[PDB]
């Protein structure tokens, strides 16, 4: 009875502090999820766990075709407040924003197997490192990049990385990165000084300008989606895009955009963007826009 149910908890890949404390149904759920994850690992594969799990800025999620999160990495707690035992075996739709359930579904199916999306998940931890009850759960945006794999069913194996809020940030900021503030139409309202030392624009001559005029046309589609995502979920990470340099040429960039809300009236105030300069000025002899003259 209790003693044999207490035995499976010890034998689950969990510490004895958190395993010896769950109910019988949770033990069954975790055991079944672990066995399904092992059955899939036997398919994908034909100590150092601390290094791999600690050096990750996200968590690994193996979700079945029906939405069952049969595997969730431990560090998920560090990023979500909701820990491994409370979420493993449950449906992804029961802990994700309903306005993203259709996209989550159309990413769970199926012949390209690579998947890259943004999804909003329940988060019950604050920036002070203190975990909060599920009733006070915010929506945290997660960039999920992974693959769909058929085995014996289909599974989505993704890495979900949170997008760091520019205010509460704790990562050496490369000198090859600069900050910028925008309105909701992505027009410059503020820029950092380093843009002069990286791209060549003075922060004054960019204010009031539409950022849609300062990047290469070949990226135009790939930016709109970002904006839309940044406007639909409040956070996005763009792809590699070419921003037209000041005196000719362009510079490669990757930008993490975050919608900032006014703390007193809870209205969207502006959009803060951390831009990572990925190269020096390429094709500096070639001019593209009218501002390069």
């Amino acid at each position: 009875e209790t003693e044999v149910f207490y035995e499976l908890a010890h034998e689950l890949p969990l510490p004895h502090s958190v395993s010896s404390h769950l109910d019988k149904a949770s033990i069954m759920r975790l055991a079944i999820s672990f066995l399904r994850t092992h059955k899939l690992l036997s398919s994908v594969c034909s100590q150092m766990d601390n290094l791999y799990l600690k050096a990750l800025e996200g968590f690994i999620a193996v979700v079945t075709q029906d939405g069952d999160m049969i595997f969730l990495s431990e560090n998920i707690s560090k990023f979500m407040g909701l820990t491994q035992v409370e979420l493993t075996g449950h449906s992804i739709f029961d802990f994700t924003h309903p306005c993203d359930h259709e996209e989550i579904r159309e990413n769970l199916t199926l012949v390209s197997t690579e998947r890259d999306f943004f999804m909003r998940m329940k988060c019950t931890v604050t920036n002070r490192g203190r975990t909060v009850n599920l009733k006070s759960a915010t929506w945290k945006v997660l960039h999920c990049t992974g693959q769909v794999r058929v085995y014996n069913l289909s599974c989505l194996i993704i890495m979900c990385e949170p997008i760091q809020h520019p205010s509460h940030m704790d990562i050496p900021l490369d000198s090859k990165t600069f900050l910028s503030r925008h309105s909701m139409d992505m027009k410059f309202t503020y820029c950092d000084d380093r843009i002069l030392e990286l791209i060549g624009y003075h922060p004054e001559e960019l204010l009031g300008r539409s950022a849609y005029e300062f990047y290469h046309a070949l990226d135009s589609e790939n930016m709109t989606k970002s904006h839309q995502n940044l406007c639909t979920k409040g956070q996005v990470v763009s792809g590699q895009y070419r921003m037209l340099a000041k005196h000719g040429g362009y510079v490669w960039l990757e930008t993490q955009g975050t919608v900032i809300y006014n703390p007193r009236n809870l209205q969207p105030q502006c959009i803060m963007c951390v831009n990572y300069v990925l190269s020096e000025i390429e094709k500096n002899d070639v001019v593209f826009s009218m501002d390069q003259t």
Partner: protein, 250 residues
């Protein structure tokens, strides 16, 4: 229901344990649980590689030499472990990324690390997202991820953007087209047709129109050109940002 979900959990545990599923009579709850304890007491590097094509590596903070590199560096970069072992990160990275590398490998001020750099694979470089911490050493995982020319115009028709392929399609430098209106390079007969197309693309916001006119080249010959254009709208304010044209010869 509690009994229905618990029974479904038990029968699913029956189906997963092989030595239990091979049985004819489904054993009682006490037996299957003991048979499951015995199955588990008898018995994620690839999960990271499957998810984001990442590989782990430990580099020294002072010299930059690697003190460990996982075998996953071969699937992600087509490079042997012998190519990475005994070498520094500064050799496996684009020359224009060493300054950025130092500012991430410097333990003077710091701890977490996150940066992007181009690593050599196979003179081809691929973009790698490196996330890790300090332990000095850096424990981090690096993961992976001319018949026409495109121009952009204001509503009036002023070149505000021109790609380099124009120098082959019409023979003009990008600076020659920029600042001037597209109808200035149009044959006077077809000029009214070009303004009519620009009148519709704005009126048919989002829709794609197509006009075919004679474009004056730098050699001063009238090259017949189909310009398919459409208005670009801001995803938030729906403001017309510009008019994107793809001017194709003949």
């Amino acid at each position: 229901r509690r009994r229905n979900k618990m029974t479904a959990y038990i029968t699913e545990l029956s189906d997963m344990v092989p030595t239990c599923s091979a049985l004819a009579r489904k054993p009682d709850k006490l037996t299957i649980l003991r048979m499951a304890v015995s199955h588990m007491k008898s018995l994620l590097k690839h999960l990271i590689l499957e998810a984001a094509d990442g590989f782990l590596f430990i580099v020294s903070c002072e010299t930059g030499r690697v003190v460990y590199v996982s075998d996953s560096v071969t699937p992600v970069l087509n490079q042997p472990q012998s190519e990475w072992f005994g070498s520094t990160l500064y050799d496996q990275v684009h020359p224009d990324d060493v300054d950025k590398l130092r500012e991430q490998l410097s333990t003077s001020e710091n701890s977490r690390r996150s940066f992007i750099c181009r690593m050599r694979c196979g003179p081809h470089f691929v973009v790698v997202h490196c996330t890790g911490y300090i332990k000095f050493c850096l424990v981090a995982i690096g993961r992976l991820q001319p018949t026409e020319f495109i121009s952009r115009h204001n509503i009036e028709g002023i070149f505000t953007f021109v790609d380099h392929r124009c120098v082959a399609t019409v023979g003009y430098q990008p600076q020659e087209l920029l600042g001037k209106n597209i109808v200035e390079f149009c044959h006077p007969e077809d000029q009214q047709l070009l303004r009519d197309s620009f009148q519709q693309v704005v009126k048919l916001k989002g829709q794609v129109l197509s006009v075919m006119f004679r474009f004056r080249s730098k050699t001063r010959e009238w090259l017949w050109m189909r310009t398919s254009s459409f208005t670009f709208q801001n995803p938030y304010s729906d403001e017309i940002e510009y008019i994107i044209c793809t001017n194709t010869n003949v």
